[PDB]
Every structure is written in C-alpha cells, then in structure tokens.
Design a protein around this ligand. Sequence first.
Ligand SMILES: Cc1cc2nc3c(=O)[nH]c(=O)nc-3n(C[C@H](O)[C@H](O)[C@H](O)COP(=O)(O)O)c2cc1C
Ligand SMILES: CC(=C/CC/C(C)=C\Cc1c(O)c(Cl)c(C)c(C=O)c1O)/C=C/C(=O)C(C)(C)O
Ligand SMILES: O=C(O)c1cc(=O)[nH]c(=O)[nH]1
Length: 367
Amino acid sequence: MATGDERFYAEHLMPTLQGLLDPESAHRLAVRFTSLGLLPRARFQDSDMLEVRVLGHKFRNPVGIAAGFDKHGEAVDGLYKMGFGFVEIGSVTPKPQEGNPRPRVFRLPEDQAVINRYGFNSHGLSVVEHRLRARQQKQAKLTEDGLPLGVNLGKNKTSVDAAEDYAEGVRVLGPLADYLVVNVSSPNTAGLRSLQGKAELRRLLTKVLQERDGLRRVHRPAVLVKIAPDLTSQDKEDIASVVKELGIDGLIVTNTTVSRPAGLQGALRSETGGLSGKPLRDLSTQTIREMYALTQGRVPIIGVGGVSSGQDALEKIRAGASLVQLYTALTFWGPPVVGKVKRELEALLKEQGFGGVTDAIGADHRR
Ligand SMILES: Cc1cc2nc3c(=O)[nH]c(=O)nc-3n(C[C@H](O)[C@H](O)[C@H](O)COP(=O)(O)O)c2cc1C
Ligand SMILES: CC(=C/CC/C(C)=C\Cc1c(O)c(Cl)c(C)c(C=O)c1O)/C=C/C(=O)C(C)(C)O
Ligand SMILES: O=C(O)c1cc(=O)[nH]c(=O)[nH]1
C-alpha cells in the first residue's frame, strides 16, 4: 500500500507531505497511522550483534524512539512494528494540559532540524495509565522478548511542588514501565531546567527514588534522568556527583538545545524553543562523552540528538551510550530510517572489529 523504500520516502514521499501539512498536523497524522499499523512491518531482521543487556533488561536492538513522538502512549505497538528496539512515551504530566499556544513546532529543512515549544501538551497520568493498563500483559511479553518500554515524566505548568509532580508520576506510571525518566531538561517550561542544579536535583531524585523503591518488585522500574545539552562543566560535574551518590540507574543525554549553532540556514532559526536534529548531533555526542567519563563508565547512558545513520549511532555508542534514540530524523526520512540506522550500524561494527554493540560501548575512552 505504501511499502517501503529508503530513497522513495526520503527523496519523494516525506518532502511532498511536508509541503502539504503544517508540522503539528503532520505529527498527529504520523501518530494516527503508526497506531493503526498502517506502515510496512519492518523487513530488517535484528542480528544477535545488535542485542544489548542493560537497565535489568534485554534490548533486541539499541535503537529507540525518543520521547515526544508518542507523548500520550497511543502508538506503542506500531512503533515496535516500525523496528525500534525500545519505545519511550511522554513526557506525561500529572494533570492534563494543553501546552503552549500555536504555532509551536517549526521545520528547518535546510538544517535537517526542528524547533519546538510544545510546553508539555499531555493527556495526563490517568488517561495514559488506562491506555497502558489495556496492554500491560502484552507489554510484559514484549519486554521479555527484548522490547522494553520507558515512560518519561514531566510536571504541570502551574504546580508549586515539582517533586510532588514527579512522585505522582512514579506512583501512577512506574508500575507500567521498564524504566522511568525524570525529565528535568525541557526548555519549554519556565524554571524546569533549574531542577538540574545540584541541591534541587538531589532533593527531587531522593524523593523519586524513595517512591520507586516502595513499588512491588515486579513493578519496580529503573530510574533515569534526562539532561540538557546546554549545561556548564560545573552543572555536569554536579549531576554526575548526585547520580553516583543516589544510585540513579542511568542518564538520557540529551534533550533539545536552546543554543542556535552558527551556520543555521532555516528561515525559522530564530523561533523560541528547543532545537533538535543534525545541528544538535555533536553537541549531544560530546555531552555523552563527558557524562560517561564523569561516571567512570558505570552509569548506563541513552544517547539521543541528531541520530540519522549507523555512523551517528556508533559515534554515540563509542562515546559511551549503551542505547540510542532518534526522533527528528523520522520527520525527514520517514520510517525507513529505522532499518537504515540498524543495517549501517551492524556493517560498521563488523568493519571496526567489534563482536557486537556491547563491545563498542565506551570504546573511544579505551583508545
Ligand atoms: C516535537 C518534539 C517534541 C519533544 N517532546 C519531548 C518530551 O515531551 N519529553 C522529552 O523528554 N523530550 C522531548 N523531545 C526531545 C527528544 O526526546 C530528543 O531528546 C531530542 O529531540 C533530540 O533527538 P532528535 O535530534 O533525534 O530529535 C521532543 C523533541 C521534539 C522534536
Ligand atoms: C503518511 C505519513 C506522513 C508523515 C507526516 C509528515 C508529512 C512529516 C512527519 C512529521 C513532521 O513533518 C514533523 Cl514537523 C513532525 C514534528 C513530526 C513528528 O512526528 C512528523 O512525524 C507517515 C509519517 C510517519 O510514519 C512518521 C515518519 C512517523 O512521521
Ligand atoms: O513539550 C515540550 O515542549 C518539550 C519537552 C522536552 O522535554 N523537550 C522538548 O524539546 N520539547
């Protein structure tokens, strides 16, 4: 019906449909089509070389969908069908909220970048809870079969106590997640990034971990903190210190950037919001490299930001990522980008003498 070529989607289908629809409508349609399974079932069969064991789980391949694509947990099964080794939904806030006024998402095709200022539009914990409960046992089997689920938590715009927002997310969605993400790095909620500060972070994560440890064993997720690419060296040292002090299970590195790298060409480069895609790529990779060294390679990292190829994935893995995610590449290349990243990553691992993804994790640090 629509299956299923790399060049066709990249050269013809995606540029045409982008020319027809504003970015938010395009996203909604993508979510709808994905959730109905109106995609080719990915033809790439994952080799054993791509398997990774981390965070108390087996991951059939190390390529996941980043938070923000499926904010409300509507397309999880369709995303596994697309070939992702793991799915992260969210960010989800405790109460439903509409997010920022439109327009709030912008394409920069000359930069293969996106700028967004959604501001945590979210159906809320209760809606997402029911959505996930309706397939909880199916997810238990997928997880067992190497396809884990992450749930990314945010906070409401008008909440007084941020820590109580994240605590409520742990209590409600923690029992449905293989891992939870404390998202303290959205650039689109006022004051949120200040929660990355040493004292605020320590207090917030102590409470998050207390809540998590009170869940029954079979419903007890790993806890990860998702961080910005715009941190000072001091901020990064402080995060690494808190992570090790508290026994945080992992880091997601990185969210979108509020910087605007010299050289951006897109007409919309000066829109407010987080920048994603290719201009973020090496900034994200360098942040992974730093965080890996500061945590002595002992804290699993999910690397994210501008991944659109096997080389992009492998650079992050060698810099210290155990797993990678992508989002923005999907908006330019479409669904075929997933098999593309996996096939190229496998070829490059073979070319560089690695036995598998596991041998490559942090390899640059051992040179
Ligand atoms: C439109 C859009 C919405 C996003 N929403 C979220 C979100 O709700 N929570 C989150 O932690 N990250 C969010 N992100 C960030 C992505 O998860 C990822 O960290 C970032 O876009 C870098 O990856 P990419 O270059 O592959 O897109 C969003 C990104 C985009 C482009
Ligand atoms: C039939 C079809 C049309 C895709 C919608 C278009 C024209 C662009 C996709 C697109 C975008 O153009 C933009 Cl800007 C965003 C933010 C998103 C986010 O999901 C996005 O998916 C299928 C799309 C997909 O399967 C994916 C690749 C998931 O978007
Ligand atoms: O909802 C959003 O605005 C959003 C959240 C986030 O974590 N990152 C992002 O780029 N946008």
